[PDB]
């Protein structure tokens, strides 16, 4: 991993290299065979609460500190180590199997003796790889040759940069003109490529041909590249591989997989630190009552060993079992089918999410644009009134051979059918060959191709209404009428869309009539003054924009012949001149853009995924702030944000202007600060300046917005936003995405959720949790995350309370017997209470729910209570500490008072009291009873009875079987469980929880 260097890549010669290149393998594994065991062990024992029981078990190797048999502390430790190793290994094997599917995709490779199939993982730098239509590009390549006659290809890059526009790509000019694809190996040529980097949108390189009579050299840009993760829209392309594996542009925009620890586990770690300090103090006090007799330091260590008992190990065992249960429940849920849990150790993170950072393309939307509204001023046609438009077109073209509303509809539809840059592409379907279909205009074989998906949606709608674009060229268009006739239009001038002009125009001549028409189409901001005076463009454009529609204004100018020649002369003259050609050309173009007849407004929607709006409403009502981070353009992002109700219909939107330096950023931040309840829409270029100079101020202003949209955001910028939110808020973040540009922020977040993309899987493979639909997020957070958090809290508090009750009982036991370090419990009792005695009543707890799932979904305000840290805090910890001390004191001192023999049977008395006490605990803590709770408690009681009968070392069964013993132990337990009844009464009434009464 040294300095990246530029490379010379010979075409078809992977061996002609001066460096070993990485294998073309995508890897999401945290470890390999060598680092697995050290990595897992260090990630476990670098925290205090694992090293705690490690050292407790290790100190038993010293006989002076020995409190019993060696296995008493190593059978539970062996169980813990086996569980963690097996869990990590299973996760690693699942990751490997899931990466094998992407790495084993098959491609064709150009070889000297013919094309040879190659797996994606065996592709080397210098290979000539063939990628078919709708197939993912497996490695970074230079476009060399395409089978399509136009000598170009379209790429879908939404998995690479989240952009909905299709990218036009051009092959190397020399290689495209070769007679055959086999000629690539017959020429001496190489590509001089730059060093690998994270720049997805810029490439510098040179193509050289050496065997040519004149030395052929050609400059390369991003227009000649096919990066891995892009999809070929049409035709089979041939490329030469430049980068593979970890040097891929998409891979270099990702970080290494890391082990994530939840915030709940860190809180339990802090609790264990506090408990250890407290027990250290207690041991210092307890050996002081010995008057430091003998080896006082050995006494300190022995008392620390006794008072810890099962505090760290039982916590670990029960928390691990609970996390297994939570992941099992999530994976089996049929209301969020297909959910995959990769990070099984952090399901409680989903219960405490404050910021949701979401992707746009492919995550909120289906990446399928559709025509929605045709507005003609007096009449507007929606999805339910398209038969009216079809009837108008049909009547026009029927009465043609055998103003009115039909004429206006026809004018609008023809303008939509003509003013675009969409090309029909015909492909053979077996029955009809492409040449046959391209001449007969076969409907089933036709596909519409353009850079803009909005234009493709418009052309598809126009076909569905009666006018079909059936052929195109650089100088001609063909339309098919409902009477099956063909109308030919000569394209005289074309004014392609630019993101600066925000409009597109075309001049055509109708060969049937000879009339010359100038059509223009663009945004309302630039087309409000280009069209003639009206009274509805602004209002209806605003209404359509408020619904989340992409609005275009379509205008028309009928040109006389002399006018067209006069314009054409000046346009040619301005084009020929090289002295500021752009400005003169622009002036000549806008010489025509005036007093244009307004035809219609068009509305195209980027279709959201199912139940996106209710899910966003639920997340907002749960107290979660949602930010949209997208690589797509500003207009599309704003339209989708309004469509998905990320921004409320009446909400103010402040679009951050482009800033380039410190002063501009300061001025615009002030301008935004002067606003209230305003959503922020900012671009990545201005966001870069703001985070460079005013990170604190920008973060403080953005965290008080109702919603934030970051468009044209690079993967590193998304990760930076996630990291900055974590740093400056101290709260948890969830990143949701579907593409490779979302991997960095998914890894950066406290809880990564990856949506399974249509044409990519990297985000799902790299995420902690994988879902198939964005709507599953609502249930995954409100039900499973909330239950995981609350169950883990109750689990951990119960385990700590039991351990501290045992500790207080041991303290009283030692005090009774001259403050000696004699264990109260030893042998199988310690092992059982560490592992098996504890798993049953707390499995009963991991089955518990405070409310039903439907109630949790219906009332998201239950989530905001968890966002306050209510389930576990220092408050509840202190109350449980006091309760444990009270119960241990009550049990020990009641045994002292009631049993005539002081402490000879104290082990049996305390064991029976603890058994009945935990039965009363589980009976009084559970809120929604489950039959498996009864089964588990029956199993626990069976285990307790089996231990009582078979443990003759410290239990005398014939002493237990006595009415005197029975009533004494019953009274002790009833007195000890007073705080249980107090807490149960406070929960039942006189302080009702908010989750119970809200239903009715
Ligand atoms: Mg995406």
Helix (H) or strand (E) holding 192: strand 189-193
953's CB contacts (< 8 A; 6+ apart) are: 827
Contacts 24+ apart (CB under 8 A), 894-898: 894/971, 894/972, 894/975, 894/976, 895/972, 896/816, 898/968, 898/971, 898/972
Q: Which of 561, 602, 603, 600 is nearest to 407 (CA)?
A: 600
State the Cα–Cα distance between residues 389 and 832, nearest whole angstrom: 78
> Binding site annotation covers 742?
yes
Check if the beta carbon of residue 528 is closer than 8 Å to that of residue 598: no
Pairing of strands 652-655, 550-559: unpaired
Bridge partners, 603 (sequence order): 373, 551
One DSSP character per residue, 359-410 reads: --TTTTEEEEEEEEEEE-SS-EE-GGGHHHHHHHHHHHHHHTT---HHHHHH
> Binding site annotation covers 225?
no
Helices (H), 772-905: 776-779, 786-816, 828-834, 836-846, 853-858, 861-867, 874-898
Pairing of strands 353-358, 732-737: parallel
* 369-605: CATH, from 2.40.50.140, 3.40.1110.10, 3.40.140.10, 3.20.20.30: 3.40.1110.10
Cα 608 to averaged position of ligand 1 atoms, centre (Å) = 13
- The three-state secondary structure class of 145 is strand
Check if the beta carbon of residue 324 is closer than 8 Å to that of residue 344: yes
Q: Which of 849, 850, 843, 829 is nearest to 936 (CA)?
A: 843
State the Cα–Cα distance between residues 326 and 473, nearest whole angstrom: 60
State the Cα–Cα distance between residues 701 and 687, nearest whole angstrom: 13
Query: 138 to each of 240, 554, 858, how far by Cα in Å?
Result: 11, 41, 44
* 36-89+260-339+780-995: CATH, from 1.10.3720.10, 3.40.50.1860, 1.20.1050.10, 1.20.1110.10: 1.20.1110.10
State whether the Cα torsion 282-286-292-294 is positive or negative: negative
Helix (H) or strand (E) holding 682: strand 678-683
Q: Which of 268, 285, 412 is nearest to 348 (CA)?
A: 268
Cα 614 to averaged position of ligand 1 atoms, centre (Å) = 21
Bridge partners, 489 (sequence order): 477, 510
Check if the beta carbon of residue 626 is closer than 8 Å to that of residue 619: yes
State the Cα–Cα distance between residues 815 and 118, nearest whole angstrom: 76
Q: Which of 573, 572, 532, 534 is nearest to 556 (CA)?
A: 532
Residue 806 is encoded by which pair of tokens? 């045992």
- The three-state secondary structure class of 480 is strand
Pairing of strands 205-209, 216-220: antiparallel
> Binding site annotation covers 630?
yes
| Annotated active-site residue in 127, 140, 265, 359 | 359
Q: What b/e string do you get for 732-766 counting C-beta neighbours within 10 Å, with b at 16 or more?
A: bbbbbbbbbbbbbbbbbbbbbbbbbbebbbbbbbb
Bridge partners, 471 (sequence order): 478
Cα 253 to averaged position of ligand 1 atoms, centre (Å) = 14
Residue 415 is encoded by which pair of tokens? 């303008």
Instruction: Indicate the Cα dihedral angle 652, 653, 659, 663, nearest 10°.
Output: 20
> Binding site annotation covers 761?
no
Check if the beta carbon of residue 778 is closer than 8 Å to that of residue 336: no
* Radius of gyration for the alpha carbons in the chain, expressed in angstroms and rounded: 36
Look up tokens 């290149």; give the residue: 21
One DSSP character per residue, 316-363 reads: HHHHHHHHHHHHHHHHH-SSSTT-EES-TT-GGGGGSEEEEEE--TTT
Give the Cα-Cα-Cα angle 44, 49, 55 (nearest 5 degrees): 85
Cα 860 to averaged position of ligand 1 atoms, centre (Å) = 27
CATH 1.20.1110.10 residue spans of the chain? 36-89+260-339+780-995
Residue 289 is encoded by which pair of tokens? 């009552």
Residue 346 is encoded by which pair of tokens? 């952090």
> Binding site annotation covers 521?
yes
State the Cα–Cα distance between residues 51 and 803, nearest whole angstrom: 18
Cα 164 to averaged position of ligand 1 atoms, centre (Å) = 9
Residue 131 is encoded by which pair of tokens? 């990628």
Contacts 24+ apart (CB under 8 A), 765-768: 765/26, 765/28, 765/95, 765/98, 765/99, 765/102, 766/28, 766/254, 766/257, 767/342, 768/260, 768/341, 768/342, 768/343, 768/346, 768/349
Bridge partners, 491 (sequence order): 508
The DSSP output letter for 596 is B
User: Is residue 866 packed enough to be buried (19+ CB in 10 Å), middle (13-18) or exposed (0-12)?
Assistant: buried
E-strand stretches of 398-529 = 423-426, 446-449, 468-472, 476-480, 486-498, 503-510, 516-522
> Binding site annotation covers 988?
no
State the Cα–Cα distance between residues 255 and 810, nearest whole angstrom: 50
Check if the beta carbon of residue 105 is closer than 8 Å to that of residue 120: yes
State the Cα–Cα distance between residues 983 and 962, nearest whole angstrom: 32
Bridge partners, 136 (sequence order): 231
State the Cα–Cα distance between residues 445 and 234, nearest whole angstrom: 13
CATH 3.40.1110.10 residue spans of the chain? 369-605
Q: Which fold has domain 7-19+123-252?
A: 2.70.150
> Binding site annotation covers 23?
no
Bridge partners, 208 (sequence order): 190, 217
For helices 906-925 and 978-988, give the axis angle rounded to 10 degrees.
0
Cα 754 to averaged position of ligand 1 atoms, centre (Å) = 10
Pairing of strands 7-10, 189-193: antiparallel
Cα 159 to averaged position of ligand 1 atoms, centre (Å) = 6
Question: What is the resolution in angstroms?
Answer: 2.3
> Binding site annotation covers 611?
no
Q: Which of 128, 117, 146 is nearest to 187 (CA)?
A: 128
Check if the beta carbon of residue 634 is closer than 8 Å to that of residue 681: yes
> Binding site annotation covers 510?
no
One DSSP character per residue, 898-947 reads: H-SS-STTHHHHHHHHHHHHHHHHHHHH-SS--HHHHHHHHHHHHHHHHH
Q: Which of 631, 630, 693, 628 is nearest to 659 (CA)?
A: 693
State the Cα–Cα distance between residues 701 and 631, nearest whole angstrom: 22
The DSSP output letter for 310 is T
State the Cα–Cα distance between residues 764 and 772, nearest whole angstrom: 9
Cα 738 to averaged position of ligand 1 atoms, centre (Å) = 5
Instruction: Indicate the Cα dihedral angle 462, 468, 474, 476, nearest 10°.
Output: -120
- The three-state secondary structure class of 501 is coil
Cα 415 to averaged position of ligand 1 atoms, centre (Å) = 33
Check if the beta carbon of residue 245 is closer than 8 Å to that of residue 22: yes
> Binding site annotation covers 307?
no
State the Cα–Cα distance between residues 832 and 2, nearest whole angstrom: 54
State the Cα–Cα distance between residues 656 and 940, nearest whole angstrom: 63
Q: What b/e string do you get for 966-998 counting C-beta neighbours within 10 Å, with b at 16 or more?
A: eebbeebbeebbebbeeeeeeeeeeeeeebeee
State the Cα–Cα distance between residues 136 and 759, nearest whole angstrom: 7
> Binding site annotation covers 566?
no
Cα 169 to averaged position of ligand 1 atoms, centre (Å) = 21
State the Cα–Cα distance between residues 333 and 846, nearest whole angstrom: 16
Instruction: Indicate the Cα dihedral angle 160, 162, 164, 166, nearest 10°.
Output: -20
Query: What separation, in Å, do the N-terminal and C-terminal C-alpha atoms of the chain show?
Result: 63
State the Cα–Cα distance between residues 776 and 774, nearest whole angstrom: 5
State the Cα–Cα distance between residues 779 and 782, nearest whole angstrom: 5
Cα 487 to averaged position of ligand 1 atoms, centre (Å) = 40
Bridge partners, 752 (sequence order): 735
Check if the beta carbon of residue 367 is closer than 8 Å to that of residue 361: yes
Instruction: Indicate the Cα dihedral angle 790, 794, 795, 798, nearest 10°.
Output: 170
> Binding site annotation covers 16?
no
- How many residues appear in the chain? 1000
Pairing of strands 446-449, 167-169: unpaired
Q: What b/e string do you get for 626-641 counting C-beta neighbours within 10 Å, with b at 16 or more?
A: bbbbbbbbbebbbbbb
Contacts 24+ apart (CB under 8 A), 982-987: 983/924, 984/924, 987/927
Give the Cα-Cα-Cα angle 312, 318, 321 (nearest 5 degrees): 135
Bridge partners, 10 (sequence order): 190
Residue 394 is encoded by which pair of tokens? 């049909």
813's CB contacts (< 8 A; 6+ apart) are: 822, 824, 892, 903, 906
Please state which CATH class domain 353-364+609-771 belongs to. Answer: alpha beta
State the Cα–Cα distance between residues 360 and 161, nearest whole angstrom: 11
Check if the beta carbon of residue 366 is closer than 8 Å to that of residue 607: yes
Residue 856 is encoded by which pair of tokens? 């949790």
Cα 492 to averaged position of ligand 1 atoms, centre (Å) = 39
412's CB contacts (< 8 A; 6+ apart) are: 374, 376, 554, 599, 600
3-state helix, strand, coil in the chain (%, to 5): 50, 20, 35
Check if the beta carbon of residue 941 is closer than 8 Å to that of residue 840: no
> Binding site annotation covers 631?
yes
State the Cα–Cα distance between residues 618 and 607, nearest whole angstrom: 20
Check if the beta carbon of residue 715 is closer than 8 Å to that of residue 357: no
> Binding site annotation covers 361?
yes
Cα 632 to averaged position of ligand 1 atoms, centre (Å) = 9
The DSSP output letter for 20 is P
Check if the beta carbon of residue 521 is closer than 8 Å to that of residue 419: yes
Is residue 359 among the annotated active site residues?
yes
Cα 654 to averaged position of ligand 1 atoms, centre (Å) = 24
Cα 767 to averaged position of ligand 1 atoms, centre (Å) = 14
Instruction: Give the other-Cβ count within 10 Å of 234's Cβ.
Output: 20
777's CB contacts (< 8 A; 6+ apart) are: 356, 615, 619, 736, 753, 771
Check if the beta carbon of residue 641 is closer than 8 Å to that of residue 724: no
Q: After which residues is the chain broken (C to N over 2.5 A)?
A: 402
State the Cα–Cα distance between residues 714 and 683, nearest whole angstrom: 10
Check if the beta carbon of residue 57 is closer than 8 Å to that of residue 45: no
State whether the Cα torsion 740-744-745-750 is positive or negative: positive
State the Cα–Cα distance between residues 703 and 967, nearest whole angstrom: 62
> Binding site annotation covers 712?
yes
- The three-state secondary structure class of 820 is coil
Query: 737 to each of 338, 637, 777, how far by Cα in Å?
Result: 16, 15, 12
CATH 3.40.50.1000 residue spans of the chain? 353-364+609-771
The DSSP output letter for 482 is T
Pairing of strands 225-226, 140-146: antiparallel
- The three-state secondary structure class of 618 is helix
User: Is residue 590 packed enough to be buried (19+ CB in 10 Å), middle (13-18) or exposed (0-12)?
Assistant: exposed
State the Cα–Cα distance between residues 523 and 500, nearest whole angstrom: 11
Q: Which of 367, 432, 11, 474 is nearest to 216 (CA)?
A: 11
């Amino acid at each position: 991993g040294g300095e990246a260097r530029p490379r010379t890549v010979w075409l078809g010669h992977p061996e002609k290299r001066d460096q070993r290149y990485p294998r073309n393998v995508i890897n999401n594994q945290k470890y390999n065979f060598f680092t697995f065991l050290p990595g897992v062990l260090f990630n476990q024992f670098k925290y205090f609460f694992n090293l705690y029981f490690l050292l407790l078990a290790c100190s038993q190797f010293v006989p002076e500190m020995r409190l019993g048999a060696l296995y008493t502390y190593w059978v539970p430790l062996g169980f813990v180590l086996a569980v963690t190793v097996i869990r990590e290994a299973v996760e690693e094997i699942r990751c490997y199997v899931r990466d094998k599917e992407v790495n084993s995709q098959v491609y064709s490779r150009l070889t000297a003796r013919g094309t040879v199939k190659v797996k994606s993982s065996n592709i080397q730098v210098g290979d000539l790889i063939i990628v078919e239509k709708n197939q993912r590009v497996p490695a970074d390549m230079i476009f060399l040759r395409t089978s399509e006659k136009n000598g170009s290809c379209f790429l879908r890059t939404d998995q690479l940069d989240g952009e909905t526009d299709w990218k036009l790509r051009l092959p190397v000019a020399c290689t495209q003109r070769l007679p055959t694809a086999a000629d690539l190996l017959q020429i001496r040529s190489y590509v001089y490529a730059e060093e690998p980097n994270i720049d997805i949108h810029n490439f510098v390189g040179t193509f050289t041909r050496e065997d040519s009579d004149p030395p052929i050299s050609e400059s390369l840009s991003i227009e000649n590249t096919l990066w891995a993760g892009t999809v070929v829209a049409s035709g089979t392309v041939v490329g030469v591989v430049l980068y593979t594996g970890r040097e891929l542009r998409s891979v270099m925009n990702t970080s290494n997989p890391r082990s994530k620890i939840g915030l709940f586990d860190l809180e339990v770690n802090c609790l264990t630190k506090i408990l250890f300090g407290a027990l250290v103090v207690v041991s210092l006090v307890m050996v002081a009552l010995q008057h430091f007799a003998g080896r006082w330091y050995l006494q300190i260590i022995r008392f620390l060993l006794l008072f810890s008992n099962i505090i760290p190990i039982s916590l670990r065992v029960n928390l691990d079992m609970g996390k297994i249960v939570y992941s099992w429940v999530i994976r089996r849920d049929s209301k969020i089918p297909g959910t995959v849990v990769r990070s099984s150790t952090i399901p409680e993170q989903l219960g405490r999410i404050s910021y949701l950072l979401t992707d746009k393309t492919g995550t909120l939307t289906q990446n399928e644009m559709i025509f929605k509204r045709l507005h003609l001023g007096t009449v507007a046609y929606g999805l339910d009134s398209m038969d009216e438009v079809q009837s108008h077109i049909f009547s026009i073209y029927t009465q043609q051979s055998q103003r009115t509303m039909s004429s206006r509809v026809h004018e609008a539809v023809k303008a939509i059918a003509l003013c675009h840059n969409v090309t029909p592409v015909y492909e053979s379907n077996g029955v009809t060959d492409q040449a046959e279909a391209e001449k007969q205009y076969e409907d089933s074989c036709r596909v519409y191709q353009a850079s803009s998906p909005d234009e493709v949606a418009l052309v598809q709608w126009t076909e569905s209404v009666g006018l079909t674009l059936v052929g195109r060229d650089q100088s001609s268009m063909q339309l098919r009428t409902p009477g099956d006739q063909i109308l030919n239009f000569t394209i005289l001038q074309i004014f392609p869309f630019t993101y600066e002009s925000k409009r597109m125009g075309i001049i055509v001549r109708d060969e049937s009539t000879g009339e010359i028409t100038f059509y223009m189409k663009g945004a309302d901001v630039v087309m409000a003054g280009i069209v003639q005076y009206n009274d509805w463009l602004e209002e209806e454009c605003g209404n359509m924009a408020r619904e989340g529609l992409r609005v275009l204004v379509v205008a028309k100018k009928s040109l006389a012949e002399e006018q067209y020649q006069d314009f054409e002369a000046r346009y040619v003259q301005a084009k020929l001149s090289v002295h500021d050609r752009s400005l003169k050309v622009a002036t000549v173009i806008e010489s025509l853009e005036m007093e244009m007849e307004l035809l219609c407004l068009t509305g195209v929607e980027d279709q959201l995924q199912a139940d996106v709006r209710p899910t966003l409403e639920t997340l907002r009502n749960a107290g979660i702030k949602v930010w949209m981070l997208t690589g797509d353009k500003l207009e599309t992002a704003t339209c989708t944000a309004k469509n998905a109700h990320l921004v409320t219909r009446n909400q103010d939107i402040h679009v951050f202007r482009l800033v380039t330096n410190r002063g501009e950023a300061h001025l615009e931040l002030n301008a935004f600060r002067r606003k209230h309840d305003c959503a922020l829409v900012i671009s990545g270029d201005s966001l870069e300046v703001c985070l460079k100079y005013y990170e604190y101020e920008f973060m403080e202003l953005a965290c008080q917005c109702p919603a934030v949209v970051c468009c044209r955001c690079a993967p590193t910028q998304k990760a930076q936003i996630v990291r900055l939110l974590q740093e400056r808020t101290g709260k948890l973040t969830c990143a949701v995405g579907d593409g490779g540009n979302d991997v960095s922020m998914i890894q950066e977040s406290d809880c990564g959720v990856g949506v399974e993309g249509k044409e990519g899987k990297q985000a799902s493979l790299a995420a902690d949790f994988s879902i198939t639909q964005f709507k599953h997020l609502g249930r995954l957070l409100m039900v499973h995350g909330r239950n995981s958090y609350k169950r883990s809290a109750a689990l951990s508090q119960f385990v700590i309370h039991r351990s501290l009750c045992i500790s207080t009982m041991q303290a009283v036991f030692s005090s009774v017997f001259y403050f000696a370090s004699v264990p109260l419990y030893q042998g199988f009792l310690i092992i059982g209470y560490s592992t098996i005695y504890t798993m049953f009543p707390v499995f009963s707890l991991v089955l518990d729910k405070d409310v039903k799932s439907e109630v949790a979904m219906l009332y998201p305000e239950l989530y905001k209570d968890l966002l306050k840290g209510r389930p576990l805090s220092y408050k509840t910890f202190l109350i449980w500490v006091l309760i444990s001390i009270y119960q241990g004191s009550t049990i020990m001192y009641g045994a002292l008072l009631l049993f005539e023999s002081e402490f000879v049977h104290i082990v049996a008395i305390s064991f029976t009291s603890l058994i009945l006490t935990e039965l009363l605990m589980v009976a009084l803590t559970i809120q929604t009873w489950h039959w498996l709770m009864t089964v588990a408690e029956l199993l626990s009681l069976a285990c307790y009875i089996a231990s009582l009968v078979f443990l003759h070392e410290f239990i005398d069964v014939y002493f237990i079987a006595t009415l005197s013993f029975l009533w004494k132990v019953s009274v002790i337990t009833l007195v000890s469980c007073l705080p249980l009844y107090v807490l149960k009464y406070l929960r039942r009434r006189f302080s009702p929880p908010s989750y119970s009464k809200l239903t009715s």
